[PDB]
Symmetry: C3
Subunit: 336 residues, 3 copies
């Protein structure tokens, strides 16, 4: 398309919402290609990632870890206004794995505190994709400080299974998984720092062990539990988008399955089916579609169980509805 044709396309400003929720959208595209506008302010902020009070100097797109999910359709243009407030101390940029050119956009979005930039790219490929900050020379440090999220580029005709049958979800959740590398003192207690820069050297030493101290969903151990647990109902169709910008993960819905899983996150690649545990490599997003069949509590985890239950990678689903004894039943309850 020419500059004139792009200038003529309708524009729609979208208000982002915080993970695990996703801003309102249509699965099947409304009309022809549009320039979808988003705005995100970067916030360097202290966040607590566990019940003990462990602190991390997060680098957060839109103030959250992960950054919010942006949703557009194939061949729409995503136009992002990215702002780096003067209150921040580091330069930041953004790299969309969904985009083509200039390192995903990082080469055109390096902004120092007090600057902003507007990047536009054509979403040519359908699927869920990671986005993350990547300043040359300090790439992993920003990413493992939480400066990453994902976007979803829906086919214009919505989702379909491998044989062309439509798959329409009732609800969608975005689970961003974060590996953190928090320095510890001689007592084995996590350290706290005044400014992000103070923690650099100590953090890089932990990073080099390739062993995170915490592996969490939505920025903290237990973030998606209790009143923040995800919800569904028997018969409800749920799409769970999951991303990990730096390290591998293996999602598993305890008590359920991934009925259709685009493990690579790309919609033109037919989904695997009937999955117990799927795999998303570091640097990618994946998506699983499931129709709940049993009520009760479910745990959604990274199935390296040490990472799930010792390091923090566990979320819960609260599901309403009638129990199905055909599917499962306790013939003899625990007894002598």
């Amino acid at each position: 398309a020419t500059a004139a044709e792009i200038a003529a396309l309708p524009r729609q400003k979208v208000e982002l919402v915080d993970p695990p929720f996703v801003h309102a959208h249509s699965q099947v595209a409304e009309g022809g290609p549009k320039v979808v506008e988003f705005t995100m302010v970067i916030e360097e902020k202290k966040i607590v990632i566990d019940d003990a009070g462990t602190e991390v100097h997060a680098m957060a797109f839109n103030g959250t870890v992960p950054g919010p999910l942006m949703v557009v359709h194939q061949d729409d243009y995503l136009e992002l206004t990215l702002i780096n407030p003067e209150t921040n101390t580091l330069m930041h940029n953004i790299n969309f794995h969904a985009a083509t050119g200039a390192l995903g956009g990082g080469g055109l979005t390096e902004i120092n505190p007090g600057e902003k930039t507007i990047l536009r790219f054509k979403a040519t490929k359908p699927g869920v994709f990671v986005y993350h900050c990547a300043p040359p020379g300090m790439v992993p440090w920003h990413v493992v400080s939480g400066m990453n999220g994902a976007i979803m580029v829906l086919p214009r005709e919505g989702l379909h299974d491998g044989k062309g049958k439509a798959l329409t979800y009732d609800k969608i959740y975005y689970v961003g998984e974060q590996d953190f590398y928090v320095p510890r003192d001689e007592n084995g207690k996590y350290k706290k720092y005044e400014a992000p820069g103070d923690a650099y050297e100590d953090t890089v030493k932990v990073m080099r062990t390739l062993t995170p101290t915490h592996v969490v969903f939505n920025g903290a151990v237990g973030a998606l539990t209790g009143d923040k647990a995800m919800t569904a109902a028997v018969g409800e169709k749920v799409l769970i988008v999951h991303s990990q910008a730096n390290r591998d993960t293996r999602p598993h819905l305890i008590g359920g399955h991934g009925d259709y899983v685009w493990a690579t996150g790309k919609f033109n690649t037919p989904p695997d089916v009937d999955q117990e545990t799927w795999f998303i490599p570091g640097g990618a997003a994946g998506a699983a579609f499931y129709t709940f069949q049993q009520p009760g509590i479910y745990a959604y985890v990274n199935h390296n169980l040490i990472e799930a239950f010792e390091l923090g990678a566990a979320a819960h689903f609260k599901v309403t509805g009638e129990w199905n004894d055909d599917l499962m039943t306790s013939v003899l309850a625990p007894s002598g």
Copy 2:
């Protein structure tokens, strides 16, 4: 199905056999859906896992690590009587990744020493699936103590390749891979404990490093080598089911291939073909089908070769038959 229809289904008790062998079964289903009954007694016992007398307080379904492979067909029901003898000291349960509801069955089978339970679930999805104990609050500890196994839910019409052609194996083996985390004292010697609970704190410390001290097949270094090597003959079709309940693995048959590999373990997902090394994420089982073409010794390993030859993840196959010079030949033997 109605309530009467379920109650009318035939019940059949099956005798289990220890891994890597598999109990008697038919690839194509015999008769209509059935309630297949299995019974497993849980044994907490000390086992030696290496050539240095290193001990692990194993938590073993049916007394073996891994627990035995249970085989049923799609839409059969699996009805398991699980027994936890009064001589054990810990509460246990079972979670079938093949099952739907109550955390895979874990929520309905929590049995203390001196108790038993019977769980029934409908095997609605075909494939090989992991099963493992998962007591709330102590999930990875039980799993990495060897309390895991797998089941196979065969399609009622048996296995097929991506084009619908039948794949009938002559024999099947179940290789359960286990990551162990054995504590060491300041001198580097593995520690021994009187009771399982005594090792809990020390073991979790090792678990959190995400670095196993041992990675083994059938519960010990060398368990499937030498006189315990698996066997085959040139021309024989072999299915190798592999599971890892907590950590990733990458099986490889040294000297052969995976002709058809259901890497995700689900039969409704077309198998990959001509595989050199396949990948099974922690929390899943996979299956590989291979027709042997050359006699001799083969090594079957986790292809992170440090895990295989330093940590213990290596098995052998002894194959009989005639050598095929067309496939391979020494044109010039090692010489000056």
Copy 3:
């Protein structure tokens, strides 16, 4: 083929070139099956892997890490003359994951310094496959000392997408990824040695931590950058073959994608498409096909960003051509 039929086949002597380049070949087979001859001399030599002067005692096929890429077509025979100079100190052999029998050839090619051997095998399966040395009892040590490479067995009809449409590349590059485990002294300084065997004990201790000190392409940090950056032009189709003989990797072309990716490396397994980051398990090779659409510098990395930017797993592509503002444009450049 009978011995006579094979003897009547034409022979072609190939000249190998150093990675990341690939020797001359035709994508579509020229004529019928042939016996393709290759010769490689094993070189035990010191290589410097980082800018701190860190040394590794490399065990290099053809004098390079990785060893060179060998290209043949399905059902051709690969006849390798392997030489172990008397100037070397250890016994070596070769195992082709592409071959069938004798542990992939290792059982028929064990050569001490001063010996040579000639192995012939039929390339029955199409795809890219790892090859590596594997001396019984010292397997991982030789592999992580750089003694590994890959071969590509092209379909006789060249490459095709999932629907059978031809995929023809303009350029091809071979990236061999290597995990190194270099011993450190009590001051954190990397140790140096005057003989390969002198480093065995120390290296094994590091290998057992499953934590490499370096993860690099083509044997060294920054190897494939600057004077060795790979090149292309907008509109050019490029195949990137990637191998890792011992440990998992997750390739990603920063600023681009894997339009078609044979993640398992096997051409009869349909390729995934529109990939952001693909996954290659330790012990395998994979291949990605991409058509460049934007000029500029691209970074090709293992997307665990710590491995890429702290440990050494990053390469560059320098692409010429016109910028495409439809695909991406800076609406507002970084500004106050």
